[PDB]
Every structure is written in C-alpha cells, then in structure tokens.
Design an enzyme around this catalytic site. Structure first.
Site, mmCIF file in Angstrom:
data_model
loop_
_atom_site.group_PDB
_atom_site.id
_atom_site.type_symbol
_atom_site.label_atom_id
_atom_site.label_comp_id
_atom_site.label_asym_id
_atom_site.label_seq_id
_atom_site.Cartn_x
_atom_site.Cartn_y
_atom_site.Cartn_z
ATOM 1 N N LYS A 50 0.838 -1.197 0.000
ATOM 2 C CA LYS A 50 0.000 0.000 0.000
ATOM 3 C C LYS A 50 0.874 1.247 0.000
ATOM 4 C CE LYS A 75 7.552 -0.505 4.386
ATOM 5 N NZ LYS A 75 6.870 -1.370 5.396
ATOM 6 C CD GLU A 102 17.543 -10.499 8.465
ATOM 7 O OE1 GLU A 102 16.847 -10.061 9.414
ATOM 8 O OE2 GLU A 102 17.914 -11.696 8.426
ATOM 9 C CE1 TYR A 103 16.934 -10.462 -1.399
ATOM 10 C CE2 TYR A 103 19.156 -11.311 -1.027
ATOM 11 C CZ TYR A 103 17.992 -11.292 -1.773
ATOM 12 O OH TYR A 103 17.902 -12.114 -2.885
ATOM 13 C CB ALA A 104 13.868 -12.057 3.233
ATOM 14 C CG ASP A 119 -0.909 -6.474 8.803
ATOM 15 O OD1 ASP A 119 -1.902 -7.050 8.307
ATOM 16 O OD2 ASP A 119 -0.154 -5.752 8.108
ATOM 17 C CD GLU A 165 -0.787 -10.348 1.911
ATOM 18 O OE1 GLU A 165 -1.661 -9.474 1.703
ATOM 19 O OE2 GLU A 165 -0.908 -11.264 2.757
ATOM 20 C CG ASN A 166 2.932 -8.235 6.090
ATOM 21 O OD1 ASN A 166 3.210 -7.709 5.015
ATOM 22 N ND2 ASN A 166 1.908 -7.844 6.833
ATOM 23 C CG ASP A 183 4.061 -4.483 7.028
ATOM 24 O OD1 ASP A 183 4.314 -3.351 7.498
ATOM 25 O OD2 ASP A 183 3.058 -4.686 6.290
#
Ligand SMILES: Nc1ncnc2c1ncn2[C@@H]1O[C@H](COP(=O)(O)OP(=O)(O)O)[C@@H](O)[C@H]1O
Ligand SMILES: Cc1onc(-c2c(Cl)cccc2Cl)c1CO
Ligand SMILES: [Cl-]
Ligand SMILES: [Cl-]
Ligand SMILES: [Mg+2]
Ligand SMILES: [Mg+2]
EC number: 2.7.11.1
Length: 265
Positions: free
Chosen positions: A17, A36, A85-87, A130, A134-135, A148
């Site tokens: 969003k 982000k 941090e990259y996932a 939440d 997606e998170n 998130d």
C-alpha cells in the site's frame, strides 16, 4: 548519517500500500540489503506517520532469528527510506501460490517458528496485529521471518485507524472495534494454519459485508482431508471469546505439532 547516494539500487522486491521495496548494495562495504521507500505526500495524505515511527522503533530494538531486522533510516524532502535485512527466498505468500497447499510437515514447522517469534514478542507485551502471508519472509536456510511491524502496538489497545485491505486474518473483537490484547495474534495463527493446509483462509467470501458476517459468527468447515490432530488445534485457536484461546506454550507442545514439526522450541 546515511543518504541515498551511498547505495546502488537493483531489482524490485515488492510493492505494498505504501512501501516500495528494492534490492540494494552499500558502496564501500558491498553489503546487500532491502530499501523500503515511502512517499511523504502519500503519508501525509493518509495520516499514517505514527505507524511508520512505531515500525522503526519496535523492529530496531528486537533481536530474534525468526524476526526481520531493521538497521536504520533517512529521508530527503520527497521520501523516507528504511534499511532492512534482505530475505533471499521471498514470501510465504508466493510459496503458497507455487504449491497450492502445504503438507503436514511444512505447516507444523512454519507454525512452530511463528509461535517462537510471537512468544518473544509478547514477552515485551508487543502485539503485531497484521500476521498474513505477504508479511512472512524466508531466510537463506528456508526459515520463516516476521516483517512489516506497521500495525503493532502495546497492550491493551483500542483501534486507531481505518482498516484498509482484507479482513480475513482479523479476530471478532478487532473488526467490531472492541478492545483487544495479545490474543488477537493467536486467532491469526489459527487462520494461518488452516490456509496452509487447505489453500485458502477459513472465512473467505465474495464481499466485505459477508466476510464480516462469517468472521463474527465463526463459520468455517473442514474439507475431508484435514486430519483429527489438525482439526483439534485449529478449533482451539478460533474461539469467539479470546480468554478461551490457548497460550503459546500450549500451541508449541500440542501433540500434532510435536509429531510433524522439524524444529524445537
Ligand atoms: N526485506 C525484504 N526482502 C525481500 N522482499 C521484501 C522485503 N520486505 C518487503 N518485501 C516485499 O515487499 C512487500 C511489501 O513489504 P511491506 O514491508 O509489507 O510493505 P507495506 O508495509 O507497505 O505492506 C512484501 O510483501 C514482500 O513481497
Ligand atoms: C523515525 C521516523 O520514522 N519516520 C519518520 C518520519 C520522517 Cl523522517 C519524516 C516524515 C514523517 C515521518 Cl513518520 C521518522 C522521524 O521522526
Ligand atoms: Cl555493515
Ligand atoms: Cl505461552
Ligand atoms: Mg505489508
Ligand atoms: Mg505497513
């Protein structure tokens, strides 16, 4: 400290969003991360400055293998930037779209890891509010990680803001704008476990108004292939009265979990 010029931007990792996320390398160290990007004008417009600030604070002072780190931040007249941090292996969401369903071993393992990170979270009276596919992000060894923290708070709490997207993972108390606590996260856990084994969430519906109905009446049924051990755990987590929901030690030690999960507590 940091600024935009310190990075090289690479490929898009996902849109939200508000968040637009990218792959990035820091120049003098060659460190890989996720950036982000938020637009200040979109943040003013919607009035969610307080969400972003809270995301920054909580996620930077937590330390747990099953929770995504937040390293820093900076802004520049147009935008705010978060350094994450990259996932490397992506979202559980995409993984579920790939396989359609998870087996009992995969599902139980995922639930163990959530229950561990949430337990660490609740021990500081932090509630996420939440938890959805997606998170949840994936580490290099496949391990699950929670991201998130935009909607998180300290308990107990009343609801703040308009609900934007989907209702599918929310408990009855929260959609009805009543007061809530730690037990919202446990309701979402049961919602999540069901969606792993079936391929879709238990209260899914065609319209807002009817999803609303099915959630507040707690109207779900199992298909024939859901085993008795699964049914037991999912029925204990999806109770209308919150105080009747189990504690997280009870989830982690449930016989069905201990028999199919491949990680300890
Ligand atoms: N650290 C990360 N590594 C890889 N992909 C990510 C990362 N963070 C976010 N993404 C992708 O971008 C999407 C949006 O991220 P999120 O932080 O949830 O933004 P919003 O709060 O606006 O939803 C995620 O669902 C995921 O697909
Ligand atoms: C920590 C933090 O997170 N977002 C911000 C922020 C900034 Cl820099 C500019 C506009 C709006 C916001 Cl919300 C800050 C700093 O107060
Ligand atoms: Cl570094
Ligand atoms: Cl517990
Ligand atoms: Mg998100
Ligand atoms: Mg957010």
């Amino acid at each position: 400290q940091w600024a935009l010029e310190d990075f090289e931007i690479g490929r898009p990792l996902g849109k939200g969003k508000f968040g637009n996320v990218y792959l990035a390398r820091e120049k003098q160290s060659k460190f890989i991360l996720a950036l982000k990007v938020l637009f200040k004008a979109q943040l003013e417009k919607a009035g969610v400055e307080h969400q972003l600030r809270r995301e920054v604070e909580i996620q930077s002072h937590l330390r747990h293998p099953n929770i995504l780190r937040l390293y820093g931040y900076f802004h520049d007249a147009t935008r705010v930037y978060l350094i994450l941090e990259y996932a490397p292996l992506g979202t559980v969401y995409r993984e579920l779209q790939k396989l359609s369903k998870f087996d009992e071993q995969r599902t139980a393992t995922y639930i163990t890891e959530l229950a561990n990170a949430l337990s660490y979270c609740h021990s500081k009276r932090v509630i996420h509010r939440d938890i959805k596919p997606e998170n949840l992000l994936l580490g290099s060894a496949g391990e699950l990680k929670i991201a998130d923290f935009g909607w998180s708070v300290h308990a107990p709490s009343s609801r703040r803001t308009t609900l934007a997207g989907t209702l599918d993972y929310l408990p009855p108390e929260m959609i009805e704008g009543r007061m809530h606590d730690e037990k919202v996260d446990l309701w979402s856990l049961g919602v999540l476990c069901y969606e792993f084994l079936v391929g879709k969430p238990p209260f899914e519906a065609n319209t807002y108004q009817e999803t609303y109905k099915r959630i507040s009446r707690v109207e779900f049924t199992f298909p024939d292939f859901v085993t008795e051990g699964a049914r037991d755990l999912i029925s204990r987590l999806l109770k209308h009265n919150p105080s009747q929901r189990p504690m997280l030690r009870e989830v982690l030690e449930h016989p069905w979990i201990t028999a199919n999960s491949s990680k300890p507590s």
